[PDB]
Design a protein around this ligand. Structure first.
Ligand SMILES: [Cu+]
Lengths: 187, 187
């Protein structure tokens, strides 16, 4: 059975941080659902790329559980994620069931908002560090990708491939990740 | 006056190779038009990401000229570009006016189809080399990004940032490219 990923797409999401993980997980044979936070309508990303989600979050959440929940960054996207009761509920359930949560750039600040994974070692975009660290609930890392158990974080558009391949490795193993990586022409 | 980019988006385009350049050029203050080859409707990319273009190609082409025309890759997307009379006309006019043409991954094979830039040093995705080189009309390079005058080519999803920042450098200069690069958390 293929593994399953939920990507939560909100207005203001960073489009590279959304599309790179979706594409790479699909290359890995993961069944990815791109879910619109606000509904099934098209989502205007931070740099004005318009993406049509596969489903509303309302619907996608009924189709769980997922092997990973993925939170893209973008300052405004992450704020929308942080404000969402539905996201809170999804992340709490994912944490409760010992499932992976992956967040990139400003995305990890939604973990803080929802009180998820406290005590974890995390990274964020440099400009999001002070927000993530408010209260000292996490330990900060400058690694490009940080994985502390079931909390996987990364720093920015330029770490998106590394982030996505870490999700692939966690779900499908090192060999699948290496196989997916080669045709990408990385490094 | 800001510089202007035309990105031609066809069914089967590689979505990372489309979104990374769009986003990065917009960070550089370039006015980017995402134009749908087939019309204004949403475009299903190679890994099933659905992008809504800003305009049809039919319309966007009336709003020229552009400082760069950008061809994403994806094997099927590039085939659609290669088959298009409208693309032929756009590229011929761009070449005639000494404007930049940028193509990534299988994208450069549309240059061959349209007889554009013969004699140039080019790169492609490794799996697209034999198609690009049919007839020996170009000289092949393994550089991640190859720029021979007004023909700028690159290799794959993993070279998309480098490709996009080379377009930024060509249009807006080295300093703008460096400024845009830093917040991306590359390398
Ligand atoms: Cu759309």
């Amino acid at each position: 059975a293929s593994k399953r990923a939920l990507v939560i797409l909100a207005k203001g999401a960073e489009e590279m941080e959304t599309v790179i993980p979706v594409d790479v997980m699909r290359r890995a044979g993961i069944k990815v659902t791109v879910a619109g936070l606000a509904g099934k309508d098209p989502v205007q990303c931070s740099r004005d790329v318009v993406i049509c989600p596969d489903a509303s979050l309302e619907d996608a959440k009924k189709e769980g559980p997922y092997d990973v929940v993925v939170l893209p960054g973008g300052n405004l996207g992450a704020q929308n994620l942080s404000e969402s009761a539905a996201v809170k509920e999804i992340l709490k359930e994912q944490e409760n069931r010992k499932g992976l949560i992956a967040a990139i750039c400003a995305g990890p600040t939604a973990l803080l908002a929802h009180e998820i994974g406290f005590g974890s070692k995390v990274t964020t975009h440099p400009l999001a560090k002070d927000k993530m660290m408010n209260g000292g609930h996490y330990t900060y890392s400058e690694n490009r990708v940080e994985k502390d158990g079931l909390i996987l974080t990364s720093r920015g558009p330029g770490t998106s491939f590394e982030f996505a391949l870490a999700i692939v490795e966690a779900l499908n193993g090192k060999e699948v990740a290496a196989q997916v990586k080669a045709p990408l022409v990385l490094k």
